[PDB]
Design a protein around this ligand. Structure first.
Ligand SMILES: Nc1ncnc2c1ncn2[C@@H]1O[C@H](COP(=O)(O)OP(=O)(O)NP(=O)(O)O)[C@@H](O)[C@H]1O
Lengths: 342, 16
């Protein structure tokens, strides 16, 4: 088989010419050539079987991506793994090849207001479909927005996605986490994705993350430094009046108007930004509302903005199964890409 | 990395 940076990529003979693209903790991503279909694809080797959390993440991403059909959401073209459970040590997910992501792009490229507007419409368009299935993505951030030079945007990486439930784990970055998650919320509400989207928008507008905290309390300090100290009702809407004490310990800070940051931004983008980054999740703009905001009027089209057929449902609680069970589920979930499955 | 116009996208295309 082919070896990429010292690792087996056992995807032949159908897939060949693997070129390394990128890396995460238990997964590597390569470009490749599909000789059966004669297209360039992306292949993710994922080796999650050592840890429960990775297993559960992998199963969520698989089930959701196979259940969703949307222009603005990455799909899964094929999945390769061994023919017995004992041999299965890795899983390869074949996806459409995208050219870059928003994170890698913003590194080297000032966006124009036109691109910003159109990228945001695309995110929210994908998100509408997501939320309409009653799914929360929960990890929206630039590195999860895949793009082409044609300016198509696809949302990827649903390892932390769940079914919304107000109200009867965690993450690389807190940078795009809604304030309520540090306070009183499990992030089981659709408002958390909206906050992430606002964070993303702010980052396209200025090429830098708006709230780059280094740890839990610092993340809050960044957020409040812009949004200003919260109102007593935004307070004690709390499910926790004992981290609220911590809030009280902080000096009052004023709301730094959005035109002082982002002085050149379009007034309508800034206005939509204000509505997406509101401290109170209940006062926070929803996906349909945001799509309908005047900033996105040119692209706004309910008739060409698809909605899920039904709510998604897991059927088993994944968080709570041992990795052995989860491995077995992963095996049965991928059997449909095996030759001779019935 | 350098972006072509919006008008390239097929989604954007069905906006005309
Ligand atoms: N289908 C794809 N087409 C092109 N690039 C992709 C694709 N899927 C993932 N990537 C890229 O692969 C790299 C990271 O993949 P990934 O394994 O998901 O990283 P991670 O640590 O798992 N998730 P993230 O924190 O969002 O980077 C990035 O450079 C992405 O741009």
């Amino acid at each position: 088989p082919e070896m990429v940076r010292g690792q087996v990529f056992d995807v032949g003979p159908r897939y060949t010419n693997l070129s390394y693209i990128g890396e995460g903790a238990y997964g590597m991503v390569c470009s490749a050539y599909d000789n059966v279909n004669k297209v360039r694809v992306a292949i993710k080797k994922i080796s999650p079987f050592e840890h429960q959390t990775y297993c559960q993440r992998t199963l969520r991403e698989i089930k959701i991506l196979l259940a969703f059909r949307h222009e603005n959401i990455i799909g899964i073209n094929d999945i390769i793994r061994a023919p017995t459970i004992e041999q299965m040590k890795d899983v390869y997910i074949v996806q459409d090849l995208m050219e870059t992501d928003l994170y890698k792009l913003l590194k080297t490229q000032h966006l124009s207001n036109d691109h910003i507007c159109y990228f945001l419409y695309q995110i929210l368009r994908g998100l509408k479909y997501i939320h309409s299935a009653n799914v929360l993505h929960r990890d929206l951030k630039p590195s999860n927005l895949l793009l082409n030079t044609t300016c198509d945007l696809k949302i990827c990486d649903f390892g932390l996605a769940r079914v919304a439930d107000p109200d009867h784990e965690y993450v690389a970055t807190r940078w795009y986490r809604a304030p309520e998650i540090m306070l009183n919320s499990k992030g089981y509400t659709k408002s958390i994705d909206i906050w992430s989207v606002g964070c993303i928008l702010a980052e396209m507008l200025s090429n830098r993350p708006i709230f780059p905290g280094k740890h839990y309390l610092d993340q809050l300090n960044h957020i409040l430094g812009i949004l200003g100290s919260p109102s007593q009702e935004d307070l004690n809407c709390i499910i926790n009046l004992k981290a609220r004490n911590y809030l009280l310990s902080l000096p009052h800070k004023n709301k730094v108007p959005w035109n002082r940051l982002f002085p050149n931004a379009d007034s309508k983008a800034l206005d939509l930004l204000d509505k997406m980054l509101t401290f109170n999740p209940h006062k926070r703009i929803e996906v349909e509302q945001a799509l309908a905001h005047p900033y996105l009027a040119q692209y706004y089209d309910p008739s060409d903005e698809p909605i899920a057929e039904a709510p998604f449902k897991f059927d088993m609680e994944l968080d709570d199964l041992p990795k052995e069970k989860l491995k077995e589920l992963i095996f049965e979930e991928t059997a449909r890409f095996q030759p001779g499955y019935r | 990395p350098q972006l072509k116009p919006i008008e390239a996208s097929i989604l954007a295309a069905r906006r005309v």
